[PDB]
Design a protein around this ligand. Structure first.
Ligand SMILES: Cc1cc2nc3c(=O)[nH]c(=O)nc-3n(C[C@H](O)[C@H](O)[C@H](O)COP(=O)(O)OP(=O)(O)OC[C@H]3O[C@@H](n4cnc5c(N)ncnc54)[C@H](O)[C@@H]3O)c2cc1C
Ligand SMILES: [Br-]
Ligand SMILES: [Cl-]
Length: 499
């Protein structure tokens, strides 16, 4: 075998996977059909993704991976166009045939700033980390076939010699050739059925200049410096600026709108569908008066999918190749970076002992399948919560309380790894969690709340219950479970900005 591991796809997942494996002593090859620079979606960084990036950096001793978790460090080391700032999430609610109220807004601010990842520069920077640590990159290739055997993997390429390796990691992310040929992908048993239009734009106005200033909204953060979600019955639109950091030089703002296909199926071209949306919601249109498009619209008719299995003797699909739900709540990078953190140590043990069996990577599958399953419950219920503001306001505390518990648990693992310096203890502690894939990670009290809350929302969809009844039901559940959650005051509805 020419190599130890072959990685398909040279975006952030594949490049970071290649970096840690090259650093750990494996002879790594990274294949890609596209080439850098190239555009990619997956821009909103979360607190969990920040800790998971810092864990990867510490666990495998690569300081440059930790630079991607903080916006100032991106600006300094990657480049000044490589990210915007993020001081939180903002969810502005809208209704067709009604003027938009500035009071219909929830915006839980963050403690430490996060990045809005300009992925063309971030993913190329991630590949450069892999290349500097000894990984080989081959771009612009054409995969003829991928053969899996009991003694190894063999990849055949157009106009080149075939390459061979012990393992193959699919990081190709929804153009996954290994997912196609194995017959793992399916949309069966998915609550979320959604499409997506997305692009990058110039001259997009800020929320403050377009809709309502800080004095009016009373928000502790500028929504300009946040992942802004414009939500409404049939779907949502995102405003993710890269031009919101003071030292930043990027002019672009990522814009993407999604529909629930059960409520609205788009019929016409992306630009026509966009203007029809701004007609429906004039408030959202205030962003795009003098705005112009910086690239083509991409239309994905169904972004949702999952897999029945995602590992074998000689392979392992990374989360994006495995399954995906929706941009909402930015769960893709969280699942991605955690799956690498779980996979990499097991691949090292396989490569070091020459044992390549499915049972060794079973905990990578269990996490990944549960994560997509959880996020499907989270998103499908969240899409149903868009129908009314008060319903959403109550509902988002279910997500937020889970995300805070999950962030604190990953922070605890980082704190123990930094002080103790014990890699095996960290790997075991991460594997020891009671609810792998879920939002809280380890808390049974939260998962009780989460799974009961989702039953209420699915009952509300199936029987078409009133929004006041559903909102009350969730409020009693929060009040029941509040004591076991963090002491933040999740139950008081009048507080729309949970510090
Ligand atoms: C519309 C949309 C919005 C999203 N929004 C968010 C968000 O707000 N927050 C968030 O955290 N996540 C989001 N995600 C998920 C996000 O895309 C992933 O978390 C992340 O981008 C995955 O990185 P990656 O390197 O695996 O994939 P990518 O960055 O897409 O890289 C994959 C690479 O594989 C290559 N490739 C494809 N097919 C083949 C083949 N047959 N052979 C060889 N190479 C191939 C591609 O050319 C590409 O270079 C979103 C996804 C979509 C579709
Ligand atoms: Br997801
Ligand atoms: Cl996501």
């Amino acid at each position: 075998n020419q190599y130890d591991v072959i990685i398909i796809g040279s975006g952030i997942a594949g490049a970071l996977t290649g970096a840690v494996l090259a650093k750990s002593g494996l002879n790594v090859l990274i294949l890609d059909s596209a080439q850098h620079p190239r555009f990619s979606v997956g821009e909103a960084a979360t607190p969990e993704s920040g800790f998971l990036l810092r864990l990867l950096s510490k666990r495998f001793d690569i300081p440059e991976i930790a630079y991607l978790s903080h916006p100032d460090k991106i600006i300094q080391h990657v480049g000044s166009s490589a990210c915007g700032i993020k001081l939180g999430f903002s969810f502005a609610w809208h209704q067709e045939n009604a003027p938009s109220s500035p009071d219909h807004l929830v915006a839980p601010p963050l403690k430490v700033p996060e990045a809005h990842l300009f992925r063309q520069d971030i993913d190329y920077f991630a590949l450069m980390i892999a290349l500097k640590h000894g990984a080989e990159s081959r771009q612009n290739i054409k995969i003829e076939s991928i053969s899996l055997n009991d003694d190894g993997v063999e990849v055949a390429l157009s106009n080149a010699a075939p390459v061979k390796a012990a393992f193959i990691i699919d990081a190709a992310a929804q153009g996954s050739p290994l997912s196609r040929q194995l017959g793992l992908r399916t949309t069966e048993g998915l609550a979320t059925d959604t499409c997506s239009f997305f692009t990058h734009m110039l001259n997009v106005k800020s929320y403050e200049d377009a809709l309502a200033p800080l004095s009016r909204t009373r928000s502790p953060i500028e929504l300009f410096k946040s992942t802004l979600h414009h939500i409404f019955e049939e779907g949502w639109l995102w405003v993710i600026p890269f031009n919101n950091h003071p030292q930043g030089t990027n002019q672009l703002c990522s814009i993407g709108f999604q529909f629930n296909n059960a409520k609205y199926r788009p019929t016409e071209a992306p630009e026509i569908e966009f203007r029809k949306l701004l007609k429906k919601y004039p408030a959202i249109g205030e962003h795009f008066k003098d705005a112009v498009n910086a690239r083509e619209w991409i239309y994905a008719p169904r972004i949702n999918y999952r897999s029945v299995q995602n590992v074998g003797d000689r392979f392992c699909l990374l989360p994006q190749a495995t399954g995906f739900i929706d941009p909402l709540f930015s769960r893709g990078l969280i699942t991605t970076f955690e799956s690498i953190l779980r996979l990499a140590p097991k691949v090292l043990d396989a490569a070091r002992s020459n044992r390549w069996q499915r049972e060794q990577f079973i905990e990578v599958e269990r996490h990944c399948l549960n994560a997509v399953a959880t996020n499907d419950q989270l998103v499908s219920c969240s899409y149903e919560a868009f129908s009314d503001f008060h319903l959403w306001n109550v509902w988002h505390r279910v997500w937020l309380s889970g995300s805070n518990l999950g962030s604190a648990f990953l922070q605890k693992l980082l704190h123990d790894l930094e002080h103790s310096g014990d890699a095996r203890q960290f790997d075991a502690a991460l594997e020891a969690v009671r609810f792998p894939g879920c939002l809280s990670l380890d808390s049974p009290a939260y998962e009780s709340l989460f799974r009961q809350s989702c039953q209420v929302m699915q009952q509300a969809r199936e029987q078409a219950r009133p929004v006041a009844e559903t909102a009350n039901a969730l409020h009693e559940l929060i009040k029941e479970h509040e004591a076991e959650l963090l002491p933040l005051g999740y139950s008081r509805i009048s507080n729309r900005f949970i510090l």
